[PDB]
C-alpha cells in the first residue's frame, strides 16, 4: 500500500486493459462491413479514433487510484 507498490497497477491493470484492446477492435471486426465499405474509412475516422481514447482513458481510469487517489 504505502510503499512504491505498483503491483496491482501492473497486474490487474496493464493486463486486462492490455487484453481487451486486442479484443475490442476485433469486436469492430465483427461489425466490419454490415454493408458499409461505403464509409469504412469514415468509420475508421469515426469508430477507431474513439476506442483508442477509450483505450487511453480507461488506463487513466486506473490512474485515479494507486498513488493519485490511493486512499
Amino acid at each position: 500500500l504505502n510503499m512504491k507498490y505498483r503491483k496491482r497497477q501492473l497486474v490487474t491493470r496493464e493486463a486486462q486493459i492490455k487484453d481487451w484492446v486486442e479484443n475490442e477492435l476485433e469486436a469492430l471486426k465483427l461489425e466490419a462491413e454490415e454493408i458499409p465499405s461505403e464509409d469504412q474509412n469514415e468509420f475508421l475516422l469515426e469508430r477507431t479514433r474513439e476506442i483508442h481514447n477509450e483505450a487511453e482513458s480507461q488506463l487513466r481510469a486506473a490512474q485515479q487510484q494507486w498513488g493519485n487517489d490511493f486512499y
Binding site: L1, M3, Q63, N68, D69, Y71
Partner: protein, 885 residues
Amino acid sequence: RKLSQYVQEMALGGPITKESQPTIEEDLTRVYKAISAQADKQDISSSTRVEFEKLYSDLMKFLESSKEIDPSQTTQLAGMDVEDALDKDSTKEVASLPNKSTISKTVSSTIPRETIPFLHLRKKTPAGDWKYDRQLSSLFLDGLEKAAFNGVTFKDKYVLITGAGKGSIGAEVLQGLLQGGAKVVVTTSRFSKQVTDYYQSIYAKYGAKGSTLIVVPFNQGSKQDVEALIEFIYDTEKNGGLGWDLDAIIPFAAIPEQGIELEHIDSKSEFAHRIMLTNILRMMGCVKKQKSARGIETRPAQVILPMSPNHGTFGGDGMYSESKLSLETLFNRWHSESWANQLTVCGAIIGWTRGTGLMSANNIIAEGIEKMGVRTFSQKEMAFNLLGLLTPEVVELCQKSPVMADLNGGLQFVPELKEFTAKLRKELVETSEVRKAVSIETALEHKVVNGLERVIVVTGFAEVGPWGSARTRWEMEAFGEFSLEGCVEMAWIMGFISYHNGNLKGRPYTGWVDSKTKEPVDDKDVKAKYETSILEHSGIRLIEPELFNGYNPEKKEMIQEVIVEEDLEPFEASKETAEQFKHQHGDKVDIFEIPETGEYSVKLLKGATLYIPKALRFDRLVAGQIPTGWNAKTYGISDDIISQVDPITLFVLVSVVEAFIASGITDPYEMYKYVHVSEVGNCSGSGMGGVSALRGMFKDRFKDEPVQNDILQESFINTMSAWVNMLLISSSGPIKTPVGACATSVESVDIGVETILSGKARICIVGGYDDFQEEGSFEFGNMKATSNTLEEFEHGRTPAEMSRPATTTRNGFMEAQGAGIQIIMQADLALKMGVPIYGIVAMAATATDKIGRSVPAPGKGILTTAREHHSSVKYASPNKRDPRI
C-alpha cells in the same frame, strides 16, 4: 586545557548539559541518530559527536544545577607601542602559564612580594584593623580549589542585583547565577527595546534547569520608588505577587563623578552620595523590616557590598571614594543593633579590572605594573572569585562572623601608586611621540624629492503586506536589515527613489544614475554605499504606527467624530438658497420654521426651536493607531480609471501582474495560443471587508459630500473579481468567490483546488484582499480581542513590538491593509512550456462540525480533528472510503 574545534563550542557543551530536562532534551537529541545518513563526512563526524554529547547529558539527568566554570582561556594584557605609526596596541595576549583556571588556581595561591597570598582574607585585629588570618584565608582559596574542576551550584537562591549592563562586573555575576540556576531579578535605569533584547539572549544563553529572570525598571535613587519594589519582591501572591525570601543581595553603583576636586559639592555629583549609601542603607534596613514582620528568622539574607582600597589615593574623586569608606560601620553595627538574625555583611574591596567594555579605568598600562612590583590583576574574570563568595559552606561562615577579604591582589603594597600610575603614562605616550615625530618628516624627506495530471502546482504569487513586495518580506524575515539589492527594491516603492533619472539633462554634460526623490534631491545618488543612511530610517520607520494623519482619509485617532444631539431654543433667522428649504420643510414640520419668500433672491429661512443640528463631539480613542502604509501607489496603472476604483481594488490589481512576472507569463493573451474553446478561467476573491467606500455609502449620504453617481457597483465582494476579468485577462468560465473571513484565503484555494481536479476548469487564481478603515474599529476594540494600547504602552512601551504571540503578553493581535495573490495549474500544462514549478498541494480543510451557542472560538481542537480522521480499529498490519489511512 586542549581546546580547538571545541573551546567555545565546549562552553556550549556545558551549556547544553546544564538545562537537562529529563526525557525531553534526550529525545530530540536521540533523533540525531534516526536520519543519520552516513554519506557526508560532516554527518559522520557529527555522528561521532552524537553519542558523546548524548553521553554526559544522559549522565546528568537530575543533578546539581550546573557549574559556574569558565572554560575560556585565562588572560592578562597586551599593551604595545609598535614601530611605525602603529602606536598603542590594546590587550588580550594569551597570558603565559595560564589558559585553564585550574592552572590559574595554584598560580593565584603562593604569591610573591612579601604577602600572605594573591587573595587573602583578613578579619578584625584583636583591637585593631585587618590582620591576614590564615584560617579565613584558607577555605576561600580552597573554594576556588573547590571550583574550576569541581562545579559551583546555586539552587534556590532568589537574589536581586542593582549592577548595570554590558561592561559591568555584575553582568558576569548575572551570567553565573543563571548558570548556577538561581532565580534572579535585575533592576535598571534605562529601559527600551535596546535594553530589552540584550536581556533576552543572556537568558537564552544561560537558562539552566531552574532559572528564571525578571527585568525591572527602577531608579535606585529617589527613595519614593525604593519601597514598592522591595514590597513587590515580597508581596502576597493574591496581590502583585513574587512571594520570595531574598536569600542574598548584591547592589552595585553607577555615577562616575570624575575630574572634580574638593571645591565642588554642587549638583548631580551631589546625587551620587544619596544613591551610593543613602537609598542603600535604608534598603538593607527595610528588608529586615519586611522579613521580621513575617517572622522568617531561620533564614537570613547575605549581602556583599563592594568596597575599595584607594580611599584618599586617586585624584579628583569628588564624593565617590569618600562615600565608599562610610560603609565599614556596618560591621560594628552587626553588634549592638538588633538585626543580626536577619542579615550578614561580607565586604569585597575589588581592585583594578582590565577589560574595557565599560568602566575599566586606565586601560593602558597593565603590564609595567606587573614588573616594577610583580603584582597581578590585569584579569577581567575576577568575578569568578566573587561567585565563590555566595556559595554554601561559606555562608556558614557568614552565619558566624563578617568577612573582610582583600580581593584586590596586592596592589596596596607599592608606595605612591599615583605618580607610579602617571609615570608609565607620562613615558609610554611620550615614547610614541618620538617615532611619530620621526615618521612624518622621514616621509616628508622622501616626498619632497619625488612626486500526475491532477497534481496541483504553485506557480506564481506576490503578497503586498505591510511591507513591500513578496521579495521583500522573505529577506526581512531572513535579516533585520535590507541587504542592498533587497533594499533599493523596497526603496523603489514609496517613491523615494527616482529610477529613470533621465539619460540626459543631468549635470549639464552626460550622466545618469538611478537617483532619489524625483525633483527635490535628484542629484545623482549612486546605488553604492549610499541610500543606507541617506534613504534609511526616515525611509524605514514610516511603515509602523499612528496610521497617519492625512491618510485614512484623516482619522486623527485622538479626536473621534461622534454625533450627540440637542434641541436648544434660541432662534437665528439665517439665509440659504432656494428650493432647499423644501427638503428642510419636508424634513421638519411646518409649525417650526416657516421659511418666507426671498424677494428678488433665492428664498428665506429660520424660526422656532428647530430640534437639530446635532452638533459634533470631541472624543479620545485608546485602541487604534497601530498599523500603516507605504506613501505611494501607482505603478504603471491606467490613470483616470483611478477616480472611481480606489480603495482596495488597486491592491489586488498590482498583485496579479507581479504574480504573473514571477510566474513568467507576461501578456495573458499568451495563453490562448495553447488553444482551448476558452472555457477556463476566473478567480475566487474573498474578504469580509472592502467596505472602504461603503463608509461613504452610509456616512456620506444624507450628509452630502461628493460621491460618484454609482457606488453600489464597487460595494460588493465579487466586483473586484469582476475587474480582474475585463480590465485584464478576460476569460468566460467559472467564478466561485467565497468569503469565509478571519480564516479566509484558503477555502478559495480549497474550493479552487476542487475546481481543477474536476475537468470542468483549468488555470485559476484565488483572492485574499482585506482592509482597515474608521469602522475597522468599534465592534473592533469593542470586540475586545483586536488590540489595545496602554498596557501595550504601559508595562511594555514597545511601539515596534506591540504583539508577540504565545507569550502571555498578548492583549490583542493586529491586522493591516494587506494584499495576497496566488495562481494554480493542472501541472501537465505547467510542464507544457513551464511557468515554472514552485510547490505541492496537500490539505483539504474547512468543515467545522461544532454547534455551541456562541461566536467565536480560536484554534484549539474546535475542528480539523475531523480532518486527520484516519481511524484505527483493529488492523496491526501494514499494506477515500479507506477508514485506515
